[PDB]
Amino acid sequence: XXNXXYX
Amino acid sequence: XXNXXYX
Ligand SMILES: C[C@@H]1O[C@@H](O[C@@H]2[C@@H](O)[C@H](O)[C@@H](CO)O[C@H]2O)C[C@](C)(N)[C@@H]1O
Ligand SMILES: C[C@@H]1O[C@@H](O[C@@H]2[C@@H](O)[C@H](O)[C@@H](CO)O[C@H]2O)C[C@](C)(N)[C@@H]1O
DSSP states (O other), rough: OOOBBBO | OOOOOOO
16 A cells, blocks of 8 residues: 555 | 544
8 A cells, every 4th residue: 555544 | 633644
């Protein structure tokens, strides 16, 4: 992954 | 805050 969030 | 990221 490598992105973050939270969704 | 309360959301996430990272920007
Ligand atoms: C911001 C980030 O926090 C840690 O990564 C988190 C990871 O431990 C956790 O399992 C997932 C899912 O809740 O959320 C990530 O944000 C470590 C990092 C990547 N070094 C960074 O500080
Ligand atoms: C506020 C934030 O806390 C840390 O990052 C969090 C990470 O440890 C955690 O696993 C995820 C999901 O619960 O949320 C992240 O925000 C480190 C940061 C990004 N430096 C920051 O202090």
